[PDB]
Paper text:
[name] ([name]) acts as an attractive guidance receptor when the [name] ([name]) ligand binds, but it mediates repulsion via repulsive guidance molecule ([name]) ligands. [name] is a single-pass transmembrane receptor belonging to the immunoglobulin (Ig) superfamily, composed of 4 N-terminal Ig-like domains, followed by 6 fibronectin type III-like domains, a single transmembrane helix, and an intracellular domain. Secreted netrins comprise an N-terminal laminin (LN) domain followed by three laminin epidermal growth factor-like repeats (LE1-3) and a C-terminal Netrin (NTR) domain. Structural studies on binary [name]-DCC and [name]-[name] complexes have identified the three [name] membrane-proximal FN domains as the [name] binding sites (Finci et al., 2014; Xu et al., 2014).
We further interrogated stoichiometry and architecture of the ternary complex using size-exclusion chromatography coupled to multiangle light scattering (SEC-MALS), and cryo-electron microscopy (cryo-EM). The ternary complex composed of NEO1FN456, [name]ΔNTR and RGMBECD could be readily formed on SEC. The peak fraction contained all three proteins and was further analyzed using SEC-MALS. The experimentally determined molecular weight (MW) (422.7 ± 2.8 kDa) matched the calculated MW of the glycosylated complex (433 kDa) confirming the presence of the 3:3:3 assembly in solution. We further analyzed the same sample with cryo-EM. Single particle analysis of the [name]-[name]-[name] complex revealed their trimeric symmetry, consistent with the complex determined by crystallography. We reconstructed a cryo-EM map to 6.0 Å resolution in which the crystallographic 3:3:3 complex could be readily fitted.
Numbering used by the authors:
A (entry chain B): 834 to 862, 879 to 911, 917 to 1083
B (entry chain N): 138 to 142, 160 to 169
C (entry chain D): 356 to 453
D (entry chain F): 169 to 263, 268 to 323
The structure:
Amino acid sequence: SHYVITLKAFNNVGEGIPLYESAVTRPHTVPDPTPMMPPVGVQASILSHDTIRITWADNSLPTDSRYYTVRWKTNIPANTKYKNANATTLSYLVTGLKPNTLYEFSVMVTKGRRSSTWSMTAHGATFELVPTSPPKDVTVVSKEGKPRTIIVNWQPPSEANGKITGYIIYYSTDVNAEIHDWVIEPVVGNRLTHQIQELTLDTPYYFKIQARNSKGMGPMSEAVQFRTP
Amino acid sequence: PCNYHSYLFCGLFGD
Amino acid sequence: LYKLSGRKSGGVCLNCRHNTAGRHCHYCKEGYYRDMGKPITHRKACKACDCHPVGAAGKTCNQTTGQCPCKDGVTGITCNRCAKGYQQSRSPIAPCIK
Amino acid sequence: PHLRTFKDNFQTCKVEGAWPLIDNNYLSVQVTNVPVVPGSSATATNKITIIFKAHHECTDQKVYQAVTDDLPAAFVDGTTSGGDSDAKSLRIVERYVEMHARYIGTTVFVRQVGRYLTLAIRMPEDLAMSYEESQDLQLCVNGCPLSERID
Ligand SMILES: *[C@@H]1O[C@H](CO)[C@@H](O)[C@H](O)[C@H]1NC(C)=O
């Protein structure tokens, strides 16, 4: 509370001119409730590319209305927050996850005003999957020095769904023709550039790049226009 | 074991 | 203290605030570790040492690096994650089992 | 984007779209560019891709990707350390985000300035002068093409 204190000098004839001052009293300290014991034996069991089941135990358990809380987060994208989910049983099934990405898991117990901190961090990495997005930023430019050679530049797709082992480049004069007509030019996954030699003159070239994975192959991308003089 | 046993710099900044 | 200083100085500060110690009145405390980025005279000179209650053995940690005394060879900075090949256990004595 | 090569050469190259700065058998660097003003000479980097090659005994192949309004402290695989968890050869430190690679003596410094990212790489001479067959396009080592250059 904010008190206003007034001081007056008084004698037998009466009270004098007052002197005022105000002060705000310091808040009473409140003791924090003693915390609970956190859950033990936290194990991550990977089931699929988007599902991981979390199992934890409780030494306090020999009725109560105590509920457990689960949290998980991936480092990509940046500065993201932990996804929370409530569980009344000793296990929880995590859904809606990305394939081939490391996740951190921990559990806490909440009884009321009294609640325990997060349990020991258990890491669970999702299973790999067939890529669901084609490689973005397809850029083709004429090389200064040796015009018969033209360099193709690509970036990895957003939905890689696993460790990329290779890349397949497709180039042909006609777009309407199927994949069997287009020449196959596969490369290594660790390299995102490839020099193409012996290219025909006065022919419009079209490009399509695909990504390689242990589970399958990446989808097709839109062709780009590039003509040779 | 895994370690290396003159440093050259490379910069890139927008306008 | 005036006798031990060789008749130089003998003034010792009373009830040191802002979690400091010594007659000089600058120092750090247990359950806490020193931040190397800022000097000892600074307010935020000692960071909180958040040692895990089931992971770490003790509360008092390493003052220069900020490492909690881990049990069963835990790799965690605050003794929060089990080591390679080790799985989380129900026992309070052995938190990680190979 | 203002270029500063290992040979201490300053060149103002447009480098529109995906262009490789560093390309060898030890480290891969890929950057894409978009103009701040539509249909103008001025350009700026929007996405940086760092690929570490699969080396036996030290670290597995980990792909790093950084875009606009996104400064990750880890790779697309979600992991913070290269290869095995016990291996401390490849590490990423955040504050400004920095990369440390003791197996190839490199230090990459990345940070968001305004609406576009910044880049700074420190690498030794021997590792910077490594090149395989059909690998001669390096903007970090050699000068950028005259076609992209403005004079
Ligand atoms: C868990 O339950 C508490 C209490 O009902 C609530 O405050 C909290 O938001 C719940 N969280 C989720 C994710 O269900």
